[PDB]
Ligand binder design. Structure first.
Ligand code: 20O
Ligand code: 20O
Lengths: 470, 469
């Protein structure tokens, strides 16, 4: 049983006493602050609104629970029981909050307003920033989606250059991150964010999240293929690696199958086992059911190049119309160890220099894709920009002397199209002057209700690469 | 509804068809593989056992749900319906698995077995590694607890050197990480792991997790203090920072209060606002209710030093018995921006060089504490080491030619004390020889039941520093 009264930074419990007396409005906004990663994919707020913020989120029992916990946590009675009771009695426990946001999947340059939050009842001035902590966690799906998309750009560039098209791009980066994230909930959120850009995942948790909170026309948003792990190879015993390989490809003879080949000696496995002993079982496979050889150790670039070199001498290689080398359609490789945005770039460039097409390879990423990310990558941040005290609106901001990068925006904000079709954020309520057309933010939450939402299909469309559109 | 049949890496769905025929046993183990972080705090498994693995975790509906999902996910009917129905019918949906583990809170050197997993029914040979994915997520609380403990060692060293004792050590690193982690669940898990070592947190989610899954004799495991955020200062308007400060310290006049002081000019705030305009409201405060000044920007070391330099000119400073400078007891500082294990070390060393006692300062850490950590920090890994096929036990392992660091252990494992009091993991069932005393692994889970549990108090005792001991 989630309790929103216990889902904030502890100090926020004490803030209702700290604002100027007679403050009736607190207005705040979220941005990926300007400071690589010049544009961000806005994704994940809809999950948060539906799972945690909407409907009756306050009850008598939840208030009492919070009261009891904070009494001990602070060793003092500081909890705003009266404020929460007001929301319970007046609004049947629905949050008197209005949130405006850019559409999910939108790709927006750094330093723009992405969403705004304000209270709709003057008694609830303190509520706007109470929910900062939970809303700021949107940094995570934003960052996964953005970093995943940047990797897609790299793959698109190199696939296009070495093959002349983008066929299969959406399957070139596979999510291996389930075991490497910090929790089950994180796994679902992170996997869903990756699926904004790609269709391949082994993080099953992502599927149910998308189905529940976003929705797709297709039965599922993401797909996988049969594959071995080291245990299904090593269990056969060291002297029987060939027997394991034979059993596995025979069990999965009519569908694609990935077989990890580095349990003892990746180079021996490729040259002698796959390349000689079991070659007859590989060359007989359909192009719809390739063997995918999976190295999993050593220097990622060096290993990929040597594996390709070996396979190229054991199997018939062709030269595509761009002049790049291509394995036969029944044989592919996946590199799924040590892949992050940096090593991904290094590998595809190294392959290009050695005249190997990117068609030959797919990538798996686990820790790099879903865990090795923090809120400071895109500087995702929530700040108060406008208050009303004694009936007077005041534009407020921080501006630390030692770090101009931490300066925050002033006043009421709105997002607009510029004459050249770019994005601009207007401060100080200047959007009201109507010199930049209509505000692009939409009301997505109001008084306990979700007022606008997006399907996962819409989100994917919004997040497309320019080259995909082109 | 959580569904264990949908809580694994997709490929594991296909593994029941890949093991050698006639395999009746798959036995696997978890270690923080050897390759800085020489010892790890084992913490978090009990949460996973209770929340996800115990009791009736298989139902008719869950099997059908998984069948339907995997049919579309694989575009093929590969799911092991028979195997899961067997567990449902035979064991009322309880997992026929035995897990043995080192006690939670134990501090164990890298490269040792921390827990093992095996099937208790030959039909369920495939189940051992089905649950690898969910169990391996224990890397996270282990890593948070370990990294938090390592920072405690640094703090202990410098607090001892500059003050002669360890008073208040357990409040020197405060958890600010709630907003900076990836989910609500991660927040609770991570916060609870930090509380193995310290008592200060603003990540409230940690308290509920501890109360539900571990338990403490005290009402709560962690505590906080009133504090401002930038919004409660900036809301007063730029020209009224002083009014904000005055209002806040007066509202919280008899309890500790932290006030963020860098909204516009941290140095002006310290020298002119706190140091002159409002000095009378500070020097009158109780030692049990100090003002804690919070910088939040700039180079962390340079800023801390300059803040201390400023305050030392405006407030009466003493010299402790170790020769280090000490602010009056109604005034302290917290650095809570950009703190991680590396910068923490830099700050305390810099303070020591400038003759400032660590008594003067506490640290807050958010992203560095709970989010900027990965599974490869401690190389937390789950591997199969033993199987029985055709009634014969076989010791199995991986040993990749290009990376000896990824070699895994062979056979049945056990953990023991060495004659010198250290730890050793015995391989190949050699623990059976009884030459190394009792196995330190205890059965914690068997056939759907949690069989051994630890309180959070016990875990804290196990995880104590030597210096504390
Ligand atoms: O290699 C694996 N899967 C896998 C392999 C290849 C691809 S692929 O090349 O994109 C692909 C996709 C669709 C059809 C054919 C090939 C997609 C997934 C799994 C063993 C690896 C894995 C899964 C989970 C966690 N860690 C590693
Ligand atoms: O400074 C803050 N709290 C805080 C300040 C000082 C300490 S302390 O110095 O360890 C301490 C502990 C116990 C009693 C008295 C003082 C402990 C916590 C909160 C504003 C900062 C915060 C909280 C949450 C997220 N981000 C920043």
């Amino acid at each position: 049983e989630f309790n929103i009264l216990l889902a904030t930074d502890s100090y926020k419990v004490t803030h209702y006493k700290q604002y100027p007396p007679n403050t009736s409005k607190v207005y705040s906004y979220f941005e990926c602050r300007e400071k690589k990663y010049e544009e961000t994919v806005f994704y994940g707020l809809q999950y948060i609104l539906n799972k945690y913020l909407k409907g009756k989120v306050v009850t008598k029992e939840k208030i009492q629970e919070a009261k009891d916990v904070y009494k001990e946590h602070f060793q003092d009675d500081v909890f705003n029981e009266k404020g929460w009771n007001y929301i319970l009695e007046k609004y049947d426990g629905h949050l008197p909050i209005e949130i405006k946001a850019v559409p999910e999947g939108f790709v927006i340059p750094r330093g723009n307003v992405l969403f705004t939050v304000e209270n709709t009842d003057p008694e609830c001035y303190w509520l706007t920033n109470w929910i900062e902590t939970i809303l700021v966690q949107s940094w995570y799906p934003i960052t996964v989606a953005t970093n995943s998309r940047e990797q897609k750009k790299i793959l698109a560039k190199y696939l296009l250059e070495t093959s002349g098209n983008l066929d299969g791009l959406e399957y070139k980066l596979h999510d291996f991150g389930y075991r490497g994230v910090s929790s089950q909930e994180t796994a679902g959120i992170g996997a869903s964010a990756h699926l904004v850009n790609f269709k391949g995942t082994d993080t099953v948790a992502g599927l149910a999240l998308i189905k529940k909170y976003y929705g797709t026309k297709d039965p599922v948003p993401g797909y996988s293929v049969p594959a071995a792990e080291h245990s299904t190879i090593t269990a056969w015993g060291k002297d029987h690696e060939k027997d394991a390989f034979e059993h596995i490809v025979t069990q999965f003879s009519s569908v694609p199958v990935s077989v990890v080949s580095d349990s003892y000696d990746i180079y021996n496995a490729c040259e002698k086992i796959w390349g000689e002993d079991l070659r007859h079982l590989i060359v007989s496979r359909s192009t719809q059911a390739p063997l995918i050889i999976r190295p999993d150790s050593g220097n990622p670039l060096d290993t990929v190049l040597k594996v390709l070199e070996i396979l190229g001498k054991k199997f018939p290689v062709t030269e595509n119309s761009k002049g790049y080398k291509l394995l036969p359609p029944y044989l592919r490789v996946i590199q799924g160890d040590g892949v992050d945005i940096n090593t991904l770039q290094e590998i595809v460039e190294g392959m290009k220099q050695k005249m190997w097409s990117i068609e030959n390879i797919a990538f798996g990423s686990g820790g790099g894709l879903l865990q090795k990310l923090t809120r400071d990558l895109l500087n995702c941040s929530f700040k108060c920009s406008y208050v009303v005290t004694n009936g007077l609106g005041i534009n407020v901001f921080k501006d630390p002397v030692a770090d101009p990068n931490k300066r925050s925006k002033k006043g009421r904000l709105s997002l607009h199209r510029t004459p050249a079709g770019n994005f601009v954020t207007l401060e100080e309520g200047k959007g009201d002057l109507e010199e930049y057309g209509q505000d692009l933010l939409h009301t997505v939450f109001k008084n306990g209700k979700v007022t606008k939402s997006y399907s996962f299909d819409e989100i994917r469309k919004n997040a497309q690469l320019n080259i995909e559109l082109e």
